[PDB]
Structure 1
C-alpha cells in the first residue's frame, strides 16, 4: 500500500522460504549464501524441509549472548543448490527502537501476509515460554500462532524475526549485522 510494504514485499519475494521442522511450518529469512535464520523453538535437526523438499542441514547454531542468555535466533546453513541475495547491508549494527514497522509472513496457512505493527520498542529482557531471553523487540499488535519466523522490517532495514506474543503484544528477536560476519 506504501513504501514500508514495498520494502517488506521486496524482502519476502527473494529472501524467504517455507521451513518445516517436527515443531511446525515457519517463515524462514535467507540472509546470504546458503545461511538463513529461524526461531530456536523450531528445534532444527540434521534434516529440514525447505519449500516441501528434504534438505540436509550443514550447520545450526542457537545464538546466546555473552552472559549465556538465550537470543531465540538459530542460524542455519542449508545444503541447497542456490544462494540467497545478500541482504546483510540491510541489518542494523546496534540495538535500537524503530517507527512504522511491518511484520511479513509466508506459510501454507498465511501466504502473502503483511501487518503494519507500528512503533517497535527495544524491550530487552523477556521470559519467553519460561526461558529468559535478551534483545527482544516489542510491538503492540495481537499476533497469533503461524506468525513465528515472520520478518520485521522498516523502510531500508531488516530488524528482527517474530518469536512470540502475549495476546496483546508481539515480540521479535533482534537481527544484528555482527551475527553474519564470516
Structure 2
C-alpha cells in the first residue's frame, strides 16, 4: 500500500503550521532552521510558526533558469529547535512515482493523510496567471487548506502541494540539490 508510516514520521518530526497574511499552510522543515512553503503564501519578514511569531531571516523564491516560478520558497527561521535533517530523503532527479501520500498539518487539520495514487512529472502549469515549472500531478480532488501539504512515497519526500483544479492535485517538486551547503552570491 502507500507508505503511511513514512508519511507520519515526516509529519511528526518535520512539519509545522505556518501562517502568513495569506492564511495557514503546512510547512515542511528540511534541515537545521531551514523550511519550505509555497511561494504564494507571500512570506514577509516575520511568520507565525505554530502560532508563535517568528523572524524570517531569509526567504528565497526559487525560479528556474528560464526565469519561471517554481512555487517553492526556502525560508530560514529564527527558532530555537533544529529540524531533523531530512535531505537524504529528497529525490536527486525529476521522476514519476507510485502510490504517494499527501499529508497536512494545519490548525483545521493538525494531522491528516490522503493517498493520491500515482504521481506524474507534469511540467508546466498555469497557477492562475503565474506560469510555473517542474510540477507533479496526481489524480485527486485536492482542496484549499491542503497547500504546503507534503507528498511522500516510502523513503522519499518529493514535493509540497501547491494547487488543484477540482479533479487533479499539483505539487512543487523538491530536489536534493535545492539544499546543499553552497555559494557566495548576493541574492536580494
TM-score w.r.t. length of structure 1: 0.98
User: Contact between 2:2 and 2:100, CA under 8 Å: does it hold in 1?
Assistant: no
Distance across 2 between alignment mates of 1:19 and 1:64: 22
User: Contact between 2:2 and 2:99, CA under 8 Å: does it hold in 1?
Assistant: no
Change (3 A) 1:100 1:174: same
Deviation of 1:7 after TM superposition, in Å, equals 0.1
TM-score w.r.t. length of structure 2: 0.95
Name stretches of at least 5 consecutive residues in structure 2 with no aligned partner.
182-188
Q: Secondary structure at the match of 2:47?
A: strand
Deviation of 1:111 after TM superposition, in Å, equals 2.0
Distance across 2 between alignment mates of 1:5 and 1:129: 32
User: Contact between 2:15 and 2:29, CA under 8 Å: does it hold in 1?
Assistant: yes
Distance across 2 between alignment mates of 1:24 and 1:36: 17
Match of 1:35 in 2: 34
Q: Secondary structure at the match of 1:81?
A: coil
Q: Secondary structure at the match of 1:89?
A: helix
Please state if 1:100 is matched with 2:93: no
Distance across 2 between alignment mates of 1:26 and 1:163: 10
Deviation of 1:3 after TM superposition, in Å, equals 5.9
Match of 1:77 in 2: 76
Q: Secondary structure at the match of 1:12?
A: helix
Distance across 1 between alignment mates of 2:106 and 2:132: 25
Give CA-to-partner distance per residue, 1:45-91, whole Å, 9 cap, x none: 00100000010000000000011010000000000011000000000
Q: Secondary structure at the match of 2:13?
A: helix
Name stretches of at least 5 consecutive residues in structure 1 with no aligned partner.
none
Match of 1:163 in 2: 162
Deviation of 1:112 after TM superposition, in Å, equals 1.1
User: Contact between 2:2 and 2:153, CA under 8 Å: does it hold in 1?
Assistant: no
Aligned length: 181
Distance across 2 between alignment mates of 1:53 and 1:110: 18
Deviation of 1:136 after TM superposition, in Å, equals 0.2
Give CA-to-partner distance per residue, 1:142-178, whole Å, 9 cap, x none: 0011000000000010000000000000000000001
Give CA-to-partner distance per residue, 1:96-131, whole Å, 9 cap, x none: 000010000011111211000000010000011111
Deviation of 1:132 after TM superposition, in Å, equals 0.6
Change (3 A) 1:113 1:74: same
Distance across 2 between alignment mates of 1:75 and 1:129: 22
User: Contact between 2:59 and 2:73, CA under 8 Å: does it hold in 1?
Assistant: yes
User: Contact between 2:100 and 2:117, CA under 8 Å: does it hold in 1?
Assistant: yes
